[PDB]
Structure formats: structure tokens, C-alpha cells
């Protein structure tokens, strides 16, 4: 029984557990659209992370050799 845990799970109840079946139709759609868009942002943020490890490693080689 956590205060911040009980309140967190209530976000579903306040947003979903109360209304239409025809609105739940066009509401569960936009909920997936949000995941897909956030899953796309996560892919690109992962790809940029790979390129930075190369960018950083090349810098570590340059800073050393130029000393």
C-alpha cells in the first residue's frame, strides 16, 4: 500500500474506466498512436547514441595523439 503507487494506477481509472464503447473505439486508437510515435522517438534516440560513441571515441583518439 503505497500512496504514490495507488495514485499512479488510478490514472487509468480516471481516463478509461468510465465512458463510452464507441469512444473507447476511437480512444484506444490514439493510445496506440502515442506508443508508436514514442517507440519511433526511442529508435532514433538509440541510433544517435550509437553514432555518439563513435564520435566520442574518435575524439579520444584525437585528443591523445595531438598531445
Amino acid at each position: 500500500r503505497e500512496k504514490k503507487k495507488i495514485l499512479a494506477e488510478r490514472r487509468k481509472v480516471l481516463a478509461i474506466d468510465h465512458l463510452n464503447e464507441d469512444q473507447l473505439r476511437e480512444k484506444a486508437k490514439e493510445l496506440w498512436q502515442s506508443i508508436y510515435n514514442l517507440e519511433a522517438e526511442k529508435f532514433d534516440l538509440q541510433e544517435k547514441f550509437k553514432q555518439q560513441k563513435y564520435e566520442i571515441n574518435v575524439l579520444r583518439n584525437r585528443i591523445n595523439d595531438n598531445q
Partner: protein
């Protein structure tokens, strides 16, 4: 020099000419890699029973709160990399004719 500087320059230009093409080829590979990673991580929607249609909409709502946290954690790693990249780059940085031809001839 063993070869002409005109050939030396022609070869340098063809090296970048394909290195660019490998980069755009790399982007097309990354574009396909994304769509495949999205059909796996974001299996598209398809239908239901008005009662047990809801516990999926509840599950989607809980997914958004976790996806955006995973998106934040990788973002803050990219953010800290930007700080170090600009910091590392700061360290290393420390270490007429045609107007004449007409007015002559």
C-alpha cells in the same frame, strides 16, 4: 610526384562521391531497420467485447507511461553525450582575377 595532381584530385573527388552514396545507403538501411523495429515493438491495432476491450485500453495507458520513461532514459544518455562531445571538442581546438583580366586586356 609519381602521378599528376590533376589525377590525385580526380581520385579524391571519387572517394567522397561513393562515401556519400554509402551514407545514403546507410540511411535507407536505417529506414528499413526502423520499420521492422516498429512492427515488432508497435504491433498495429485490430479488433471487440465492450467489457474486455477496456482492460486492453488500460494496458495501453500503462504502456505509454513506461514507453516514455524508456524514451527518457535513452534521451538523457544522448543528452549527456552532447555535453561530453562539446566538452571534448573544446579541449582539442586549443591544441581578384576576372576583375583584372578585363581591366588589363
Amino acid at each position: 610526384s609519381k602521378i599528376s595532381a590533376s589525377r590525385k584530385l580526380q581520385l579524391k573527388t571519387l572517394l567522397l562521391q561513393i562515401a556519400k552514396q554509402e551514407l545514403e545507403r546507410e540511411a535507407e538501411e536505417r529506414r528499413g531497420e526502423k520499420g521492422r523495429a516498429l512492427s515488432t515493438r508497435a504491433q498495429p491495432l485490430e479488433l471487440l467485447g465492450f467489457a474486455e476491450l477496456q482492460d486492453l485500453a488500460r494496458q495501453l495507458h500503462a504502456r505509454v507511461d513506461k514507453v516514455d520513461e524508456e524514451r527518457y532514459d535513452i534521451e538523457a544518455k544522448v543528452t549527456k553525450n552532447i555535453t561530453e562531445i562539446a566538452d571534448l571538442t573544446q579541449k582539442i581546438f586549443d591544441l581578384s582575377a576576372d576583375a583584372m583580366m578585363q581591366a588589363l586586356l
